[PDB]
């Protein structure tokens with residue numbers, strides 16, 4: 001049921017936006033068509049975990065006429081797509097930035113035959129603008145609008161900050177200077193777990209876990225009923241774990257199943273595997289890593305991958321996952337004491353995360 | 359004085375943003391330093407026409423106090439000024455990447471900086487736009503005009519992005535625009551018409567360069583309903599088109615030394631005012647030679663497009679266009695002045711920064 005109403009609102013949203021461009025922006029049929037495909041290709045096809053979470057939270061809180069349920073669930077759907085569109089925006093720009101080839105089992109947007117890189121960048125910008133346009137259209141007379149948009153913007157900002165941390169993680173920060181060029185790090189002195197946790201917290205945790213929960217709370221007019229300090233603890237913990245999984249899958253999950261080809265090794269990214277390996281590797285292991293990491297060369301890439309499974313990074317992963325699962329469990333109970341309905345939706349959200357195969 | 363106050367608020371805004379990143383985003387000194395440099399390089403060095411206009415319109419509508427109101431209105435105007443300047447900074451960063459430009463404001467484009475990777479530049483541009491929202495909320499959280507102000511700011515942001523779409527896809531046959539099928543630059547240039555050009559410029563420049571500064575100035579001095587918006591929009595659109603025509607003409611004929619930026623319009627096969635105007639009057643021979651030289655990085659093929667423009671006396675067309683614009687602007691400003699003398703005066707001042715700008 002959730003999926004069907006969620007998609008119904010997507011058509012409703014798509015109709016409003018496209019018709020508006022046609023009627024108020026003097027847009028031609030050819031560009032309206034291009035934008036429709038852009039929207040479907042960049043916004044659909046994922047797991048919709050962020051969007052569907054808003055709906056489930058809203059529903060879980062609508063008890064603490066029958067029309068209020070309808071308006072609340074519809075508002076939740078719109079918020080769901082605001083987050084999905086926000087991600088679509090970041091994925092379009094992210095793929096360009098990470099030089100990726102595929103996404104969701106298809107070419108990345110900037111990789112489509114008739115999509116130029118220059119237009120792709122702007123297309124990404126349109127995706128973000130659409131989040132504001134839809135919000136203003138549906139939540140015009142809604143009293144929670146300023147707070148809703150205020151939080152949404154803050155999370156948008158946090159994500160951009162995280163992206164900054166991500167794209168500059170492989171360059172000696174002490175030498176970061178706009179006026180002087182610098183090659184990738186060779187000593188990898190900054191590939192630490194501390195630096196890794198910061199990257200992930202900001203680039204993924206906030207928009208993937210905190211935002212969905214928060215928007216679900218707002219449309220249900222129930223944000224002040226929950227322990228926010230515990231909610232953020234959970235959001236951050238789950239988000240970190242989510243990204244660690246994303247990193248692991250990038251290196252070990254076959255594209256066929258993953259839906260995308262990994263670029264972390266080639267992009268010399270400060271991934272969970274990299275920092276974990278480096279912290280435990282011998283000087284010999286580190287030397288070999290240094291002579292193979294950050295290269296497009298298939299064999300060099302293959303060597304890094306082997307260096308990883310010989311340092312038993314899977315054993316570390318299983319131990320990490322267990323540690324997180326334990327903390328999550330505890331935090332969810334603390335949350336359950338005064339916010340049982342909400343703690344339950346958080347449980348369901350963790351159900352879509354713990355040991356996902358994506 | 360206008361500038362002095364404007365720069366004081368810049369420092370205040372910068373301090374707020376950078377310190378927040380340090381205290382709430384766990385940012386290190388190195389990256390704080392990078393962002394400070396990114397902000398300065400990206401938001402400073404221009405003419406500040408858009409930002410200074412917000413301040414000037416605001417001050418003019420004031421007469422509609424014991425110092426408190428004036429102090430607040432002018433400061434709000436400065437914040438809005440920077441919101442527009444940061445919004446442009448955002449677009450300029452991305453636009454330079456999109457247009458493969460080399461210099462800007464006399465310096466390398468942001469993404470051309472020795473230590474700025476293209477991938478980071480794209481995101482730095484995103485940060486610039488986010489800052490407009492952060493500063494807005496920080497300073498206007500309690501203002502009654504917050505929602506209306508942000509609603510309008512976001513609409514103009516959206517219109518600008520739509521303009522960019524029109525601009526970047528203007529050299530490709532739209533009938534064949536299809537994500538799944540590659541397609542080369544137009545060879546017949548059938549879409550390089552004045553009609554299509556007016557649409558490109560209206561959305562990509564007119565709204566955020568002329569309408570937004572005025573509208574924001576009115577909002578902060580709380581006098582938005584005191585002006586004939588139909589006339590104000592007509593004026594903004596006309597002045598905006600003209601401004602972009604100047605930008606296109608300068609791209610081709612103003613030496614980079616004075617311009618501060620190297621032109622890329624011909625090499626990029628852009629639907630510029632010069633191209634559309636040339637094609638509409640050119641003989642069949644001129645059109646052939648145009649098609650054989652336009653959209654190439656070859657220094658002699660671009661020099662031929664320049665000579666073609668001079669041969670077709672595009673300066674004669676420009677002078678006439680300029681006069682036609684000046685004529686309407688004057689008549690529109692008079693229509694404004696009848697009901698809004700203070701506002702009409704500030705619009706005159708803006709026109710003065712536009713008309714025959716040497717830029």
Ligand SMILES: C[SH](C)CC(O)(P(=O)(O)O)P(=O)(O)O
Nearest residue numbers: 090091094095098203204246
């Ligand atoms: C928007 S960012 C979280 C997207 C990724 O998770 P990345 O951080 O690893 O680049 P991706 O594997 O989907 O490219």
Ligand SMILES: C[SH](C)CC(O)(P(=O)(O)O)P(=O)(O)O
Nearest residue numbers: 449450453454457562563605
């Ligand atoms: C943001 S756009 C109006 C910037 C330009 O005016 P463009 O439209 O000609 O690319 P530019 O000459 O300053 O690059």
Ligand SMILES: [Mg+2]
Nearest residue numbers: 094095098100
């Ligand atoms: Mg990526």
Ligand SMILES: [Mg+2]
Nearest residue numbers: 094097098166
């Ligand atoms: Mg990335």
Ligand SMILES: [Mg+2]
Nearest residue numbers: 246247250264
């Ligand atoms: Mg990844």
Ligand SMILES: [Mg+2]
Nearest residue numbers: 453454457459
């Ligand atoms: Mg440009």
Ligand SMILES: [Mg+2]
Nearest residue numbers: 453456457525
């Ligand atoms: Mg451009």
Ligand SMILES: [Mg+2]
Nearest residue numbers: 605606609623
């Ligand atoms: Mg130009």
